[model samples]
Target: GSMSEEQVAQDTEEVFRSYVFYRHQQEQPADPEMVTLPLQPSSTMGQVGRQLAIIGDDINRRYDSEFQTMLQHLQPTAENAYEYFTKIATSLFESGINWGRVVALLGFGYRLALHVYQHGLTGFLGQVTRFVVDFMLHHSIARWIAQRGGWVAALNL
Candidate 1:
């Protein structure tokens, strides 16, 4: 049967939301004592808090490094490469860490690029519109890849 764009969009939203919900529900908390390394006997609470802050910063550093690896494959080389790379990586931190998440970020990035291509970045919308539509678009893409060759093939590509 034929499906309209609206219907496909809705279906993708439903599935992506369901998958996110499932992942969230299945997540379990780790005991602080277990997840955190042992502190020195003299370590103070303030020191522990500082270390926690460092941990958060370190995580962002790692995400940035991973984002760089993906950017390299895109082979961005131009005067605006820095600008483009930063925007893409920024979206990634907000969306997630998986390739599917990266694709959605790129989809929106390309959508914005079209506007910039036509009317420059300054003329572009301050707030990106129809994010759900963008999300569903990429979700459909990921779904098609999965259906055609399964995760093994999808991940390889």
Candidate 2:
């Protein structure tokens, strides 16, 4: 398929793995893929997650609380997840519209699902992915990236 296009996925995995280690205080996630399989992001959305990982620690330092607060209120419904996406994204936007801030939301949302499933639940796979998918593809962010060039073209970094 698209071998050179593997950068985004690779970057997203690093973020997830590092965050898993950082948050859990150890690297017990087995493997990053094992953790994020349920994420189900499109390649473009995967790029967003990749974008977040580039500065995950910086974003985590500044906006970790936002994600944590969001994690606390997440429910497995489109209305619930969608609402929080908008709310958190609005705040994320307030940090000023950088692709960095926008993508950081995905990092948090991805973790939100991981945390929820850990609490003795399953079945929120594609179920919850809608939130992140919608956030990236369904919002102006995707459009902005499109205008510049899709994630692949726009984010070669």
Candidate 3:
């Protein structure tokens, strides 16, 4: 089965986001925010998200090696199981900001100018606002966890 490069690129991007988001959800974001107060069973999206996370983590670990070598690097540390990927995740977010802004700007019918013009200021602002808020929250949580080695350890230490 031949895989197209374009398809591989797209899937890779999705997988990266899935992993980053899962790390945010599992380690950064508080559990209460992830699951509703009702204590209901996890949603299908949540489950799928978790699976995607595992896959992404595996990919990162295997990124620079052959089958055995990659497996050797990914021994599943406590931090890895939780939030070991914070530094890389933070780096990805920073790198993606401009790209995200470009996407939003285009989606909102904006033209790049001296100051750049975003036609749908209201809607565009909302989108940007949400993105910033979420990014900030996740970034904060990730940094906090990274600094402390994980939430639980952070709390106890």
Which prediction has the highest lDDT against the true structure? 2
Write candidate 1's Cα lDDT for 1-157 as tens digits: 3445554444333333322222222322221121222233223422322332332344434565564566555544334544664566555656444545533443334334333433342322212223433543454643443344422332354
Q: How far is candidate 2 from the true structure (C-alpha RMSD, Å)?
A: 6.9
Error of 1 at 90 (Å): 12
* Candidate 1 least-lDDT 10 residues: 28-37
Q: In candidate 2, what are the lDDT values of residues 1-157, reduced to their tens digit? A: 2322233334334334333434433212222333454244444444344444554655466765775675666554434555655677666666445565645655665565565555425434344455554555445555555554444543555
Error of 1 at 57 (Å): 24
**What stretches of model 2 exceed 4 Å from their correct place?**
1-79, 94-96, 153-157
Model 1 misplacement above 4 A? 29-132, 138-157
Candidate 1 vs candidate 3: which has greater lDDT? 1
Q: Say which candidate scores most in TM-score.
A: 2
Total residue pair clashes for candidate 3 = 0
- Decide which is better by lDDT, 2 or 3: 2
**Global CA lDDT computed for model 2:** 0.49
The per-prediction tally of clashing pairs is 0, 0, 0
Model 3, 1-157: lDDT tens digits are 3333333333322322333345444332122222221112243333433454443454334442463353345443322322323343355556544323322222211111101112211212222223322443454432432343322231132
